[PDB]
Symmetry: D2
Subunit: 116 residues, 4 copies
């Protein structure tokens, strides 16, 4: 898969299960059009966000719904969500893995880009 997102819970030391991930694409008119949507599973990854034939070049926004993940566990988090905005496939096809690591009051993101 061209796009992979991994979400980790830094307070409980495990993958963040059922975190909602929404991918959008900046559409011609500077509008963000909905491009993919999933919920992480056990592993911490949402399955099959896109395919290599639809994952065209563009500016994608990956938005992770962090608020809801810590409110169901009883914690009141600082952020409303986590988002990553990046230009993809501009210089040619790559595979991107976005890693988010969560804590009620901090989050880190890292991209690991590869040449298929």
């Amino acid at each position: 898969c061209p796009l992979m997102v991994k979400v980790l819970d830094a307070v409980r030391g495990s993958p963040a299960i059922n975190v909602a991930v929404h991918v959008f694409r900046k559409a011609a008119d500077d509008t963000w059009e909905p491009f993919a949507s999933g919920k992480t599973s056990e592993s911490g990854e949402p399955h099959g966000l896109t395919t290599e034939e639809e994952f065209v070049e563009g500016i994608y926004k990956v938005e992770i719904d962090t608020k809801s993940y810590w409110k169901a566990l009883g914690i009141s988090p600082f952020h409303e969500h986590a988002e990553v905005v990046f230009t993809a496939n501009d210089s040619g096809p790559r595979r991107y893995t976005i890693a988010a690591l969560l804590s009620p009051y901090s989050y880190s993101t890292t991209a690991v880009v590869t040449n298929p």
Copy 2:
């Protein structure tokens, strides 16, 4: 100041000077209204963002312009920008410190909230 943002460079080990930071406030109408803006100075921070009587309750979005700091250094970074979205002063007035730690391909955000 009620809102302070500190931006740091993890490649060269110093504060990121002249990063533009913009603060918006979600307006009645789900609209983001510009509410403050500044550049990081020698210490890694934009001065005077706002005042304790302007900083009222609301959903605030802090946008750090990441791409322009790495590009001026010869680096082609992953992210378009960095943004932090949080609900402020809900519970009563506090002092928020946002810290941003930058690398071409990764960034962390941490919030330190202080007593009303």
Copy 3:
């Protein structure tokens, strides 16, 4: 595998290839005895550090040689190395994954523990 370490490069957005990882075990006499040794490969993981039959309970030290990885690329890093000290298998058998994310002047570690 019971023990897995993943090392990532936050400045170049890829796995850290050829990073030396040494695992020790606090031996009866508070001495650290050498327990395993590897070098990461493409993926960012050293292969086969230990087996489930030797990975007994104990206090393990995972030491990552970060200095050498950034000096060969021309950068002069802040830390001499990165280390993670943890108690393993105390409450029963688990699988531990240690993730280190690197930058000349910062590093983060995260453990993702699982019940085999």
Copy 4:
């Protein structure tokens, strides 16, 4: 002060008060010699670690006692402790700020070095 260490709590969003921090100095003989020690106060930092004429060139190891801060809060954390090992004042005198950001299962360290 030439050496300042700031320790922060990522679960509750505040500085970690009363974390014990110890600084050692690798002695002639590859020996670690105790060289300073303190507890984080209300602001997340131990005061007076050392003085500009005691802080000379050398390999320094800063050890943050992580396990005891999480255990006093009812949390059973992953790491025994946190340590930062760096060569100081090599190149001439500078001011180092070490920041530690804690979560039960993850920690980050960042160094901010300032002009001789």
